[PDB]
Amino acid sequence: ADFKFEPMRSLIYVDCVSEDYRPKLQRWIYKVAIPDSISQFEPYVTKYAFYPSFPIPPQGDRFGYARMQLTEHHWLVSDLDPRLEIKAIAETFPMDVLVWQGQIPAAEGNPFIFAFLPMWWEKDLKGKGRTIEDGANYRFNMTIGFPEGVDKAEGEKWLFEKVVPILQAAPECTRVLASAVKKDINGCVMDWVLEIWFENQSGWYKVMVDDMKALEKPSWAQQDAFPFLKPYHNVCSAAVADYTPSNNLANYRGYITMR
Amino acid sequence: ADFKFEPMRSLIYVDCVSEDYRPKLQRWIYKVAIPDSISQFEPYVTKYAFYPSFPIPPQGDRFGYARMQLTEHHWLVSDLDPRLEIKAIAETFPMDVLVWQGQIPAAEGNPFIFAFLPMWWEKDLKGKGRTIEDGANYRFNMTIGFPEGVDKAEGEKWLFEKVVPILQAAPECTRVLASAVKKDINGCVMDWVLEIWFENQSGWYKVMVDDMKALEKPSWAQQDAFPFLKPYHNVCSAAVADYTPSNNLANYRGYITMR
Amino acid sequence: ADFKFEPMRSLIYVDCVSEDYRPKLQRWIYKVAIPDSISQFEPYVTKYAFYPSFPIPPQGDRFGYARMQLTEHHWLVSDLDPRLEIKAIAETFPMDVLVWQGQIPAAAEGNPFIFAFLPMWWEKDLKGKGRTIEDGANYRFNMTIGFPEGVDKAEGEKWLFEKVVPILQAAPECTRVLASAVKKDINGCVMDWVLEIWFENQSGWYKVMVDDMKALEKPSWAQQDAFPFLKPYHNVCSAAVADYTPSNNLANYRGYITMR
Amino acid sequence: ADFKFEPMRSLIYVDCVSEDYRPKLQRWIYKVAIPDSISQFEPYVTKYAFYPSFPIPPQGDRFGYARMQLTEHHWLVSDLDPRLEIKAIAETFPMDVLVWQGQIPAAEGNPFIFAFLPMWWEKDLKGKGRTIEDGANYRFNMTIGFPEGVDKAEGEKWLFEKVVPILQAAPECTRVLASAVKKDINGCVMDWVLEIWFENQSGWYKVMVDDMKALEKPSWAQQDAFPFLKPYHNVCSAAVADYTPSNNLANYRGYITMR
Amino acid sequence: ADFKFEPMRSLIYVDCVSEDYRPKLQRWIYKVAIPDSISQFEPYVTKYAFYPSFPIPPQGDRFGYARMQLTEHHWLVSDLDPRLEIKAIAETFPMDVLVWQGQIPAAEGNPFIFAFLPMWWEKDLKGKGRTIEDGANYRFNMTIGFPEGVDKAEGEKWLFEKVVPILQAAPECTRVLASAVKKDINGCVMDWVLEIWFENQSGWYKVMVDDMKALEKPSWAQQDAFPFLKPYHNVCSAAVADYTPSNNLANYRGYITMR
Amino acid sequence: ADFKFEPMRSLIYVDCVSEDYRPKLQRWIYKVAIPDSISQFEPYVTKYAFYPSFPIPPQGDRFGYARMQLTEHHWLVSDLDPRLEIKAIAETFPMDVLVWQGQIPEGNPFIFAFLPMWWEKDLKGKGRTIEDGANYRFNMTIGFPEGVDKAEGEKWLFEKVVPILQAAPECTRVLASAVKKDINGCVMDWVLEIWFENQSGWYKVMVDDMKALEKPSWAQQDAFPFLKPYHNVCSAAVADYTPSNNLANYRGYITMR
Ligand SMILES: O=C1c2c(O)cc(O)cc2O[C@H](c2ccc(O)c(O)c2)[C@H]1O
Ligand SMILES: O=C1c2c(O)cc(O)cc2O[C@H](c2ccc(O)c(O)c2)[C@H]1O
Ligand SMILES: O=C1c2c(O)cc(O)cc2O[C@H](c2ccc(O)c(O)c2)[C@H]1O
Ligand SMILES: O=C1c2c(O)cc(O)cc2O[C@H](c2ccc(O)c(O)c2)[C@H]1O
Ligand SMILES: O=C1c2c(O)cc(O)cc2O[C@H](c2ccc(O)c(O)c2)[C@H]1O
Ligand SMILES: O=C1c2c(O)cc(O)cc2O[C@H](c2ccc(O)c(O)c2)[C@H]1O
Ligand SMILES: O=C1c2c(O)cc(O)cc2O[C@H](c2ccc(O)c(O)c2)[C@H]1O
Ligand SMILES: O=C1c2c(O)cc(O)cc2O[C@H](c2ccc(O)c(O)c2)[C@H]1O
Ligand SMILES: O=C1c2c(O)cc(O)cc2O[C@H](c2ccc(O)c(O)c2)[C@H]1O
Ligand SMILES: O=C1c2c(O)cc(O)cc2O[C@H](c2ccc(O)c(O)c2)[C@H]1O
Ligand SMILES: O=C1c2c(O)cc(O)cc2O[C@H](c2ccc(O)c(O)c2)[C@H]1O
Ligand SMILES: O=C1c2c(O)cc(O)cc2O[C@H](c2ccc(O)c(O)c2)[C@H]1O
Ligand SMILES: [Cl-]
Ligand SMILES: [Cl-]
Ligand SMILES: [Cl-]
Ligand SMILES: [Cl-]
Ligand SMILES: [Cl-]
Ligand SMILES: [Cl-]
Ligand SMILES: [Cl-]
Ligand SMILES: [Cl-]
Ligand SMILES: [Cl-]
Ligand SMILES: [Cl-]
Ligand SMILES: [Cl-]
Ligand SMILES: [Cl-]
Ligand SMILES: [Cl-]
Ligand SMILES: [Cl-]
Ligand SMILES: [Cl-]
Ligand SMILES: [Cl-]
Ligand SMILES: [Cl-]
Ligand SMILES: [Cl-]
Ligand SMILES: [K+]
């Protein structure tokens, strides 16, 4: 019988690998994914939302920048409980979506990154007490997973002892938050999620490219420059606004077409 | 102090024993039951909905067909916890409602069937992977309880080894789902709930009447024909659509009268 | 340029000619019709609603009883203005729907699409003025009628109000009587009158609309032996509905969410 | 046939003549009036709202201060068109409500003031360009009607040439707005509606009592002090906030009771 | 990792120490507090609501009468879990609010009373089975905490064996409910919350002042008359209606200004 | 007294002249503009919506491509009636917004076009439903330069430009309405919506197929659309659906966690 109370926030990194796909992918998301999703998890998900990503910044490609959006669930139970595999109605999820997101080509293909977190950030490392009145945030959400055969403790150490200090040093960076990915849920390859706030694109660039040149290149690096990880495979990211109109449990009133 | 996290889906089988009662019963449900209900359980029920039943099919009477609707709650806690018996405001629930539903007459009445289930089906026995795009479903929801002094294991065996195979054999039947009733909650007499999908009434009839003639009549049978159980006492049912507008936690905006 | 302020209530009489069609028709209505409709007229329709019909009563067939629902719009402008024919996105409205509703017979003769325009308020209040909702639940029998070809409209009117209505007023089982004249100038609808006639329940309806109405003289233009003396689904349609619907679509619709 | 496009804002001044009545009156308003109202005018009213009145200030009684609320409609057509007298369902409006509001006593009662206006203010006389960011407003809405046999032109002149200048002189007064009442609609006795903003009660008092002592007492005065008009008969008023949660066409989800 | 399922109803007693503050405080609550709050706890709070308090009755000051409102949350988890201290965006909560509520004097200064309860009343002591149809309720919600060095068991005994019987004796009192405050959550000084229903203000007065004169004055009393406790410090209260339009999770559509 | 029933659809072409401005402009729109707007016109506007623009396509700059969104109102009355100038509460609309949109730095006009609520001309793709697939909806407005006969401009548009659209299978729809110049003296004359399947289709037709066009004598640039970007032409490409249907959807400026 028993089901465990397991309150979590999940993030899905939705890419769009080509502008010609964007209409079609966006359609599927707002016309199909939403109702199909709510139809299943309404009773045990307290918040379902999409945060469309800002235009990819210079060198965003190197950070596995998701060119469509972040998809964000708040669960009361583990969606990976085997018992939850059974659904009266199943979702309509064509191959094409995987093409559009870049999981498949038509190029090598790219994993589907679905990270589970506690509902609250584990580490507040810069900008505690910042209110919304303090101004609009360029919120750079980035997840990372250390390559195979790299001790996780060492990766952690690198992240917090070498990377974060650079963020703290930069006045252009207004906030730093981190949570450890719950690997015990769906075997997601990622280890950490961070959100790193700037004022704008230029701030992001200055810090995440230029300030990060100062970093020692680690021996396990999969690219020459920070983040030293394979785009879309061991790192994904998006820059998003403070607010989304796509708070789907409250806001969705059907797929009403423009006139 | 402590309250157990106990996520469940419940079903109430609401009959209407006479067309002359229908206006009055429907009024009570939508004018009174909804606000009275929400007023009590809003904070610990994630979904409250009514699925009005399709017109009773031929020989539906023999299946304890609920001629008004299904009432459907999703609980986060056991509503039968004794501590939940205390309410500031109590509901308005007159005798007349029980007359209308057939719990009372005006020479014997019919029990109130209130079945608690896990939030997800335990057994998927036909039609896995069916999406909503596959077409409109005549969803025949049926619950059953084996008569007194009938070994539950034998009843189970009969159901899955004799009844279900007939459902699987019939191309007219698109889906079969089952959960065991949680008897430990409110001593509901029912043992199983199934949902059995057809394309329409004629499909339902063909299978649930005609194909079921082939069944051996068991020694505990309370009627000659399948389902071999006492209508409204050891079997209730309803046929409903895939969709209801009465998703009460989202949709209810008062008892607005037509003009 | 100019567009006329033309506030109206319309009614569409949606039949379902067979129980095997009901799932499919209902699907189309709630999954497709709603979004397609709102997508077009949201800015100039103040209220869009469906009132599902109660189970067809005995001899309801003779009154063109719509076995699915009433569809109800409140317009700010005439939807039949020619300029409103142009739509960026068009609706998905397959033949099959017409089969299901009974406009087409599929593969004798089908049944017209009855789409009646009215003023937003009833023109005639003939019984039960001042009745509140506290007075109890209503079996609301909405019925529209059109007098056959070559029947003087004035005479039809006279018959309706001087012969039919008095029977309704005589019956204690009948709690309310309302009528409006159909706006024929809008979409050439064949109907002339819409009435709503309230009872307590089905039995009341039957007693009055069948039994009390036997007393009526059969008029010379009658298209059937018994009241309403008009061709089912062609010169008369009807539905019995509740006081309340959850399908108030402009407020309530949150997508086609499926049961679990 | 034809119906005139007649876009108007109306105000009803709802008093509560005794604290013992307040529960009962408030109940009727939110439990009964709202649904009954929407049930009638949903299709031709674009906004229906209640603005509960702040606690009656010192000497508010002399201004016909409505101790319950303002009721506010936005019409597309004249509700006094005779054709609109016909309604399928009628409202439940007991005598008691009139007692509670003070239309009836137990030694003389008070008229029901229902004033129709254009949807936009006709005169902006102080504080043009004030935004909501400029701070919270004590919004003193007051309507007045000159006694019988008082030339309307003279009344107008008095109002704008003697009264208003005092408002403009007072720094405590942040805003002044006025519209002429549409007398042609429902024969309302009132001639003008003004809204006069302060920072708070004390500001209101300073200006509307103390500064107004300087006013010449006119020969038609029905009381010694400004506003020189018979409370609740030739003057009503309320002080309200910038925002109400009772925006009934959007917000109402039934009469849900506290737990 | 693990987070405890901890379903609770909390109450905050919001005072307004001066009518000149009321506009400003009300503004902050509805313009700022709501969005700031929802922005944080939407996923783990099932109901967030304000119940504005009726006008302070005679001698209400002696009961720590909250002159603005009750603030009411329903939690799924303890908000005092240390891990919940971390928020991406923090709330805007100026000093001024504390002045307005009376926590600071800008007069002696008064604690912020934030009481956690089970979601259901622990004791039903009068009026069980009362429905909303039985009439409108003057709901007097009162919380109390016994002064320092007063045995809690004795306080309890006094409350239930001496105070409550007076409530039961009075036909003017329609309902009595009580829950023990969860002291283990946020060290709230209060021990009990009761709701005590009347028909109106006069009923309240008759019982809570006049009938309560009959009470023996205990040796620990901090004032001469019942409730024998220090206003706003060891007792707070409010009288509220059965219904509020400020059911914020459902109803809030922005801070829309009147016209 | 009397107010004229004047049902109209308006479009505002909201640019964002720099990515560094985008956070700030977007904030103002969703945090401030919405409530300020609804607070004023709720009773006489039936639909208020934002359609965020797709990423600017190649050579979009030449079409006055609005890099933030389209803003879309449906009015029951003329918002330019002088009597509607009076508001209890006024909007917060700082200079900075005009900088961000590009009205202020040469500087670019504020394009606010009023239309009938229904398209006047349906020139390709009549009867297309939403089931026919997702649309790249290229909304473009144009105004002929000063001293250019309007009749000739019209003729050019419908007899030379549109036929190229009709010829292209990549173009699924063509719609046009004449701008109501009598309302707010908007400089634009026409609004068209022109549908494609995607960006590449748009480009193929609106750049490559349009090379075939004779360059008119009044042209303000060498290539189609032959009009001054952001001044005599603005445009946006948008989706069939927006979540920002503000009268229904807005529940406050709730921040991500
Ligand atoms: O929005 C969603 C979404 C999406 O936007 C893009 C995508 O590529 C996959 C998706 O899948 C999400 C999902 C997660 C967990 C579930 O259990 C589920 O049924 C659906 C869905 O909600
Ligand atoms: O959780 C999952 C999921 C889901 O629950 C719901 C849903 O609507 C889509 C989904 O899509 C995920 C997926 C698809 C393709 C892949 O290649 C892959 O690795 C993962 C799957 O894992
Ligand atoms: O709280 C309750 C309730 C309610 O809140 C609202 C309402 O509209 C009906 C109700 O009735 C429920 C009920 C449960 C079991 C029974 O056997 C029964 O007869 C009634 C009761 O639990
Ligand atoms: O809709 C409802 C309902 C109904 O439709 C019909 C009916 O006969 C009883 C009902 O009672 C339901 C209920 C069950 C358990 C509870 O604990 C409760 O509070 C309410 C109520 O929700
Ligand atoms: O716009 C329309 C429309 C729509 O948008 C959506 C929808 O689901 C059905 C519809 O049906 C209407 C209709 C079609 C054909 C007729 O012959 C007729 O009288 C009415 C049509 O006008
Ligand atoms: O619900 C609706 C409906 C329906 O249920 C059944 C049906 O057979 C036709 C319908 O058509 C309605 C409609 C009428 C006029 C229009 O101009 C329009 O756009 C749509 C639609 O709204
Ligand atoms: O339709 C109306 C109405 C209503 O629909 C609902 C309701 O709750 C109250 C109402 O009261 C209004 C009214 C106006 C003037 C009066 O003098 C009076 O007694 C009542 C009336 O216009
Ligand atoms: O809120 C309302 C209201 C009220 O609060 C108090 C009151 O004393 C009368 C009222 O009557 C309003 C109303 C006015 C004109 C109408 O035509 C109508 O139908 C209703 C109603 O809406
Ligand atoms: O409405 C609210 C509120 C209020 O009205 C008045 C007040 O003086 C403080 C407040 O604070 C409440 C709150 C409690 C716990 C939290 O964790 C939180 O984030 C917010 C807030 O919801
Ligand atoms: O969690 C809390 C909280 C919060 O999260 C958000 C918010 O907007 C207000 C809040 O108010 C509470 C508070 C404020 C000041 C105090 O002096 C005090 O004792 C308590 C605090 O408990
Ligand atoms: O009321 C108005 C308004 C508003 O309420 C809210 C808002 O966010 C912007 C606004 O802007 C409108 C406007 C401003 C400047 C212009 O140059 C122009 O053409 C239009 C103004 O009319
Ligand atoms: O959202 C809107 C909007 C906008 O998004 C961007 C912008 O640059 C100006 C704007 O102004 C719109 C508006 C136009 C005319 C009015 O009279 C009014 O009150 C408001 C407003 O609604
Ligand atoms: Cl700001
Ligand atoms: Cl590299
Ligand atoms: Cl009873
Ligand atoms: Cl389909
Ligand atoms: Cl038995
Ligand atoms: Cl057994
Ligand atoms: Cl039998
Ligand atoms: Cl009743
Ligand atoms: Cl016959
Ligand atoms: Cl709405
Ligand atoms: Cl402020
Ligand atoms: Cl007089
Ligand atoms: Cl006097
Ligand atoms: Cl501060
Ligand atoms: Cl009552
Ligand atoms: Cl103490
Ligand atoms: Cl004392
Ligand atoms: Cl909601
Ligand atoms: K480096």
Q: What is the 3-state secondary structure (H, E, C) of F21-47?
A: CHHHHHHHHHHHHHHHHHHHHHHHEEE
CB contact under 8 A, F134 and A23: yes
Which tokens go with E176? Answer: 């009595």
Residue B38 touches partner E, C-beta closer than 8 Å: no
What is the DSSP code (8-state) at residue E89?
S
Q: Which two tokens stand for residue A97?
A: 């979506």
Radius of gyration of chain F (CA): 18
> Considering CB atoms only, which of B9, B46, B131 is closest to A91?
B131
Q: Is D195 on the interface with F (CB under 8 A)?
A: yes
What SS3 class is residue B109?
Answer: coil
| Cβ atoms of residues D57 and D239 within 8 Å | yes
| Distance of alpha carbon D55 from alpha carbon E53, whole angstroms | 11
Which sign, positive or negative, has the C-alpha torsion F120, F125, F126, F128?
A: negative
Distance CA A83, CA B9 (A): 14
Q: Is the CB of A40 under 6 A from ligand 1?
A: yes
Nearest to D44 by CA among D12, D87, D14: D87
The Cα E122–Cα D129 span in angstroms is 54
Counting one residue from chain B and one from chain E, the pairs whose CB atoms sit within 8 A come to 56
Residue D44, ligand 8, Cβ within 6 A: no
CA nearest to F102, candidates F186, F22, F37: F22
F73 phi, psi to nearest 5 deg:
-110, 150
Q: How far is the CA of C103 from the centre of ligand 2 (A)?
A: 44
Whether D92 contacts chain B with CB within 8 A: no
Backbone angles phi, psi at F133, to 5 degrees: 120, 170
Question: Are E25 and E207 spatial neighbours (Cβ–Cβ below 8 Å)?
Answer: no
Compute CA E68 distance to the chain's CA centroid, rounded to the nearest angstrom. Answer: 11
**Which residues from C are below 8 Å from D74, CB to CB?**
none
Interchain contact C169–B (C-beta under 8 A): no
Distance separating alpha carbons of residues A179 and A171, to the nearest angstrom? 22
Token couple for C178: 């309302």
Closest CA to F2 of D184, C76, D42: D184
| Closest chain A C-alpha to E55 CA, distance in angstroms | 34
Which residue, among C89, C90, C132, C112, has the nearest Cα to C235 in the 3D structure?
A: C112
**Rounded to whole angstroms, how far apart are CA atoms E20 and E22?**
6
- How many other C-beta atoms can be found within 10 angstroms of the C-beta atom of residue B16? 22
DSSP-derived secondary structure letter, A216: P
CA of B109: how far to CAs of B11, B104, B106, in Å? Answer: 20, 5, 9
Interface contacts D/F by beta carbons within 8 Å: 54
- Report how far residue F3's alpha carbon sits from residue D8's, in angstroms, rounded to the nearest whole number: 10
**CB contact burial E20-48 (16+ within 10 A = b; e otherwise):** bbbbbbbbbbbbbbbbbbbbbbbbbbbbb
Q: Retrieve residue E48's tokens.
A: 């967030």
| β-strands B8-14, B69-75 pairing | antiparallel
Measure the CA–CA gap between C27 and B137, rounded to whole angstroms.
Answer: 9
Task: Give the tokens for residue B45.
Answer: 């029920």
CA angle F233, F237, F238 (to 5 degrees): 135
Q: Which of B7, B131, B195 sits opposite A90 (nearest CB)?
A: B131
Question: Closest Cα of chain A to B132: distance in Å?
Answer: 6
Tokens 């896990």 belong to residue: B118
From C73, E251, F116, A135, select the one nearest D253 (Cα to Cα): E251
SS3 of B79, please? coil
Question: Is-contact F77 F4, C-beta < 8 A?
Answer: yes
**D27 in contact with B, Cβ within 8 Å:** no
Task: Give the experimental resolution in Å.
Answer: 2.8
For ligand 10, atom 8, the nearest C-alpha belongs to E91
Residue C24 near residue C96 (C-beta atoms within 8 A):
yes
Q: Which atom of ligand 3 is nearest to the CA of B79?
A: 22
- HEC assignment per residue over F146-204: CCCCHHHHHHHHHHHHHHHHHHCCCEEEEEEEECCHHHHCCCCCEEEEEEECCHHHHHH
Looking at the partner chain, which of C46, C124, C176 has a beta carbon nearest the beta carbon of D43? C46
Burial group, residue B171, by CB count within 10 angstroms (0-12, 13-18, 19+)? exposed
Bridge partner list, F190: F142, F178
Evaluate whether A33 touches F243 at the Cβ level (below 8 Å).
Answer: no
With beta carbons less than 8 A apart as the criterion, state whether E191 and E155 touch.
Answer: yes
Please answer yes or no on whether F90 and D177 come within 8 Å at the CB atom.
no
Structure token digits, residue A197:
């706030």
- Nearest neighbour of A35 by CB, restricted to C42, C43, C255: C255
What residues have CB less than 8 Å from E39, skipping those under 6 apart? A132, E89, F254, F255, F257
Chain centroid, CA A211 distance in Å: 23
Q: Are D27 and D92 in contact (CB under 8 A)?
A: no
Q: What is the 3-state secondary structure (H, E, C) of C88-126?
A: CCECCCCHHHHHHHCCCCCCCCCCCCCEEEEECCCCEEE
CA distance D98 to D87: 22
Name the residue among E233, E230, E237 with its Cα closest to residue E208. Answer: E237
C135: helix, strand or coil: helix
- Local structure of residue E124 (DSSP, 8 states): E
Kindly state the helix (H) or strand (E) to which residue A80 belongs, with its residue range.
Answer: none
The structure tokens listed for B259 are 């003009």
Cα distance between residue A62 and residue A58, in whole Å: 9
In the structure, ligand 15 is a single-atom ion and the residues with CB under 5 Å from it are B 94-95
Burial level of F220, CB count in 10 A (0-12/13-18/19+)?
middle
Of B200, B241, B257, nearest to C20 by CB-CB distance is B200
Handedness of CA D94, D100, D103, D106 (dihedral sign): positive
Write the DSSP string, D78-100: -TTSGGGG--SSBP---HHHHHH
Return left, alpha or beta for D143; rule: phi > 0 is left, psi -120 to 50 is alpha, else beta: beta
Which residues lie below 8 Å from residue C154, measured CB to CB, with a gap of 6+? none
Best substitution site from F37, F45, F89 to test ligand 11's pocket, by max atoms within 8 Å of Cβ?
Answer: F37
Name the residue among F207, F197, F239 with its Cα closest to residue F62: F207
- Tell me how far apart the alpha carbons of residues E148 and E155 are, in angstroms, rounded to a whole number: 11
User: Given a contact as 3+ CB pairs under 8 Å, which chains touch A?
Assistant: B, C, E, F
Alpha carbon of B200 to those of B54, B172, E112: distances in Å?
10, 9, 62
Residues of C in contact with B256 (CB under 8 A): 244, 248
Query: With a CB-CB cutoff of 8 Å, which residues 72-91 of chain F face chain C?
Result: 74, 76
Test mutation, A120, A128, A138, A242, chain E, max E CBs within 10 A: A120
Helix H or strand E encompassing B136: none
- Rounded Cα–Cα distance for residues B147 and B190 (Å): 9
- For chain F, helix, strand, coil in percent to 5 are 30, 25, 45
Half-sphere exposure of F194 (CA within 13 A, CB side): 25
Q: Which residues of C touch D46 (CB under 8 A)?
A: 46
- The whole-angstrom separation of Cα B57 and Cα D189 is 63
Q: Could you give the CA distance from residue B137 to residue B121 in angstroms, rounded to a whole number? A: 17
Residue entry with tokens 């039985």 = E134
Dihedral pair phi/psi, residue A156, rounded to 5°: -50, -50
CB count within 10 Å of CB D93 equals 13
- Please report the sign of the dihedral spanned by the C-alpha atoms of residue E207, residue E209, residue E210, residue E214: positive
* D206 reaches F (C-beta below 8 A): no
Chain D: list its partners (3+ Cβ pairs within 8 Å): B, C, E, F
Strands in E97-158 per DSSP E: 114-118, 123-126, 138-144
Q: Which two tokens stand for residue E68?
A: 């603005």
Nearest residue (CA) to ligand 10, atom 22 = E114
DSSP character at residue D247: B
Q: Tell me the backbone φ, ψ of residue C53, rounded to 5 degrees.
A: -85, 145
Peptide bond into C55 cis (omega under 30): no
Q: How far D62 CA sits from the closest chain F CA (Å)?
A: 26
Q: Where does chain D have alpha helices with state H?
A: 22-27, 34-41, 95-101, 152-158, 164-169, 183-186, 201-205, 248-251
In this structure, what token pair is assigned to residue C233? 């689904």
| C-beta separation of C242 from C17 below 8 A | no
Give chain F's end-to-end CA distance (angstroms, integer). 50
Distance from CA of B120 to the nearest CA of A (A): 6
Handedness of CA B17, C50, D7, E251 (dihedral sign): positive
Q: How far, rounded to the nearest angstrom, does the alpha carbon of residue D5 sit from its chain's CA centroid?
A: 24
Contact B80, B4 (CB under 8 A): no
- Closest to C200 measured CA to CA, from C228, C166, C171, C180: C171
Alpha-carbon E33 to chain mean position? 18
Instruction: Spell out where chain E has E strands.
Output: 8-14, 45-52, 69-75, 114-118, 123-126, 138-144, 173-180, 192-198, 235-240
| Closest C-alpha among A48, A49, A55 to residue A22 | A55
Between CA C36 and CA B38 the distance in angstroms is 32
Q: List Cα–Cα distances, D123 to B74, D75, D120, D196, F210, in angstroms.
A: 55, 21, 9, 12, 54
Rounded CA-CA distance A124/A130 in Å is: 11
Order of strands, sheet of B45-52, starting from the edge strand that comes earlier in the sequence: B45-52, B69-75, B8-14, B114-118
Are B40 and B87 contacting, i.e. CB atoms less than 8 angstroms apart? yes
Pocket flag, ligand 1, residue A72 (CB < 6 Å): no
Task: Tell me how far apart the alpha carbons of residues F137 and F130 are, in angstroms, rounded to a whole number.
Answer: 12
| Beta-ladder partners of D177 | D124, D195
D135: left (phi over 0), alpha (psi -120 to 50) or beta: left
| Partner-chain contact A51 F250, CB within 8 Å | no
- Of E46, C204, E234, nearest to B45 (Cα)? E46
The pocket around ligand 3, CB under 6 angstroms, is made up of B 33, 36-37, 40, 91, 93, 112, 114
Amino acid (1-letter code) at residue D108: E
Enter the tokens of residue E54: 């009726």
Partner B contacted by C132 (CB < 8 A): no
**Which chain D residues are Cβ-neighbours of C47 within 8 angstroms?**
42-43
Residues in contact with ligand 12 by the CB-under-6-Å rule are: F 12, 14, 29, 33, 37, 40-41, 71, 79, 101
Helices (H) and strands (E) in chain B, counts: 8, 9
State how far the Cα of B40 lies from the Cα of C170, in Å rounded to an integer: 45
Name D252's Cβ contacts closer than 8 Å, sequence gap at least 6: B253, B254, D34, D35, D38, E245
D194's CB contacts (< 8 A; 6+ apart) are D141, D142, D143, D144, D176, D177, D178
Distance set, CA F94 to CA C160, E225, F86, F98 (Å): 66, 58, 19, 8
Contact in structure between F246 and F73 (CB atoms under 8 Å): no
Pocket of ligand 6, beta carbon within 6 A: C 12, 14, 29, 33, 37, 40-41, 71, 79, 97, 101
Which residues does chain C have within 8 Å of residue A256's beta carbon, measured at their own beta carbons? 35, 38-39, 42
Q: How far apart are CA E195 and CA E174, in angstroms?
A: 11
C5: phi then psi, degrees, rounded to nearest 5: -65, 110
- Measured CA to CA, the distance from residue D143 to residue D158 in angstroms comes to 15
Sign of CA dihedral B31, B36, B38, B44: negative
Altogether, the residues listed in chain D come to a count of: 259
Tell whether omega for the bond before A55 is within 30 degrees of 0, i.e. cis: no
A10 closest CA partner among A147, A160, A158, A141:
A141
CA-nearest residue for atom 4, ligand 10, is E91
* Contact of F116 with F176, CB cutoff 8 Å: no
Q: Choose one of A17, A69, A71, A87 to mutate for the ligand 1 pocket test, by most ligand atoms within 8 angstroms of C-beta.
A: A71
* Strand-pair partners of E47: E74
The CA-based angle E105-E111-E116, given to 5 degrees, is 150
Q: 3-state class of E165 per DSSP?
A: helix
The phi, psi pair for C137, rounded to 5°, reads -75, 140
Q: Which two tokens stand for residue F118?
A: 């229904």
Name which of C41, C30, C24 is nearest C95 in CA terms: C24
- Interval between CA E252 and ligand 10 midpoint (Å): 21
Tell me which residue of F229, F225, F113, F235 sits closest to F162, measured CA to CA. Answer: F225
Residue partners of B58: CB distance under 8 A and separation at least 6: B201, B205, B209
- Express the helix, strand and coil content of chain D in percent, nearest 5 each: 30, 25, 45
Give me A36's structure tokens: 């199909």
| Residue pairs between chains D and E whose CB atoms are closer than 8 Å | 120
Q: Which residues in chain D touch residue B40, judged by CB atoms under 8 angstroms apart?
A: 259
E57 interfaces chain D, CB cutoff of 8 Å? yes
Q: Which residue of C has its CA nearest to D4?
A: C5
Which residues does chain A have within 8 Å of residue B177's beta carbon, measured at their own beta carbons? 86, 88
- The residue written with tokens 């059907």 in the block is A254
Contact status of A32 with chain C (Cβ, < 8 Å): no
What are the distances in angstroms from CA E136 to CA A123, D30, D238, E198?
A: 50, 12, 25, 9
Return the bridge partners of F171, or none. Answer: F196
